Ligand binder design. Structure first.
Ligand code: NI
Ligand code: NI
Lengths: 219, 213
């Protein structure tokens, strides 16, 4: 039951503000050392901040690039740690992780982040949200799919016949276009003896824009 | 400041091989080095702390070693559970800086790609945009060149490609290349060819389609 659950992420304007919350249960929280880590596809993992409990020493540490702008906070009756982010930049885009360290004392032999949270996505951008335009990709073994074009921000989730297709389904990672908008392609490889007679439906869903559109693919 | 370099950056190996991963430091971190594994879409989980010690549950295939500034991560007989990204992290003193990470891939036998091409849809051809998609499936290795030919004129600056992660079923790759065009330019041209060059094929294959046919 030892688990960290992050929340508060989403899209935000440059120079904006955002408060990431991290709830915890399954362990006595009011002496654990909590750390925030972020991950972007470019720089990989990067430590952001740490807050210790009952420590006359600094007790609060920050990465150099986030001092001044960020502030880590703690409330022990709520068993949660917070990350208030201000003057947000496109740098600061990434997946933010909450994690507990194994250090109880100033220098407790045995250091590592032993429990992680699923993570919360943070997107810093000036572009407004947009639902996707879903276009069909029409046709031994055949292939067909969909073109999920021009949406923002990530993510968009794609399923076929409502979670009914498993093997051969390939949903490619989203690529940013010159217009600053994302598209995406999901393709399914089916035996050639099943085209048309069986209906293949394309379940696109973009929760940032409250979009839910399904388009039939027909040869 | 305490930089940390990690080597290599990418690495491929078969099931059953042994792989060594290096994490160099700009200082004698003594022995407070931690290694993590991160699989696609999941959170990292510790493999080794204190350079050599393995926490509970981590198989004994993993072993760390080294001291001072050179440190190594080691895997005897890679079983298929072990192909994500590996980060090193020092805990000598805050800030707890991370290493650049090493992506680790399975290496199977060569597999040629199956090539499909898709013309734009009339639905899409009602709004002024035209995207032509060339699909590649279940090939290895991942390095593949996709060139677009419009009226047999080599194309540049208007193609965008995307690769999928190593597949779990058979450790193959997939690629879509999308030729983005304006509608007026699409209606101007006829022969749209996608030429694929890959290790697994002996001759560069081409898939085409006529807009009018
Ligand atoms: Ni020393
Ligand atoms: Ni032209």
């Amino acid at each position: 039951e030892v688990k960290l659950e992050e929340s508060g992420g989403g899209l935000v304007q440059p120079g904006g503000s955002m408060k990431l919350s991290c709830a915890a249960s399954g362990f006595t929280f009011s002496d654990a050392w909590m750390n925030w880590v972020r991950q972007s596809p470019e720089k990989g993992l990067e430590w952001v901040a740490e807050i210790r409990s009952k420590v006359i020493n600094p007790a609060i540490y920050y990465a150099e690039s986030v001092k001044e702008r960020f502030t880590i906070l703690r409330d022990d009756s709520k068993s949660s740690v917070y990350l208030q982010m201000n003057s947000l930049r496109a740098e600061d885009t990434g997946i933010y992780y909450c994690s507990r360290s194994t250090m109880i004392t100033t220098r407790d032999p045995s250091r590592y982040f032993d429990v992680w949270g699923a993570g919360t996505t943070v997107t810093v951008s000036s572009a407004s949200t947009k639902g996707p335009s879903v276009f069909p990709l029409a046709p031994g073994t055949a292939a067909l799919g969909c073109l999920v074009k021009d949406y923002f921000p990530e993510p968009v989730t794609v399923s076929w016949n409502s979670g009914a297709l498993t093997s051969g389904v390939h949903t490619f990672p989203a690529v940013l276009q010159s217009s600053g908008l994302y598209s995406l392609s999901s393709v399914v490889t089916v035996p050639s003896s099943s085209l048309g007679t069986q209906t293949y439906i394309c379940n696109v869903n973009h929760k940032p824009s409250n979009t839910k559109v399904d388009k039939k693919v027909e040869p | 400041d305490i930089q940390m370099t990690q080597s290599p950056t990418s690495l491929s190996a078969s099931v059953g091989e042994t792989v060594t991963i290096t994490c160099r430091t700009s200082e004698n971190i003594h022995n407070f080095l931690t290694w993590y594994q991160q699989k696609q879409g999941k959170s990292p989980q510790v493999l080794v702390y204190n350079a050599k010690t393995l926490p509970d549950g981590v198989p004994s295939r993993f072993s760390g070693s080294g001291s001072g500034t050179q440190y190594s991560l080691k895997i005897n007989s890679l079983q298929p559970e072990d192909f994500g990204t590996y980060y090193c992290q020092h805990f000598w003193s805050s800030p707890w800086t991370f290493g650049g990470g090493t992506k680790l891939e399975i290496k199977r036998t060569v597999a040629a790609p199956s090539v499909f091409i898709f013309p734009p849809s009339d639905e899409q051809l009602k709004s002024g945009t035209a995207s032509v998609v060339c699909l590649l499936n279940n090939f290895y290795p991942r390095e593949a060149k996709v060139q677009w030919k419009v009226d047999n004129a080599l194309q540049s600056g208007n193609s965008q490609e995307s690769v999928t992660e190593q597949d779990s079923k058979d450790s193959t790759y997939s690629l879509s290349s999308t030729l983005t065009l304006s509608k007026a330019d699409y209606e101007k041209h006829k022969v749209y060819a996608c030429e694929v060059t890959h290790q697994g094929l002996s001759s560069p294959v081409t898939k085409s389609f006529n807009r009018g046919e």
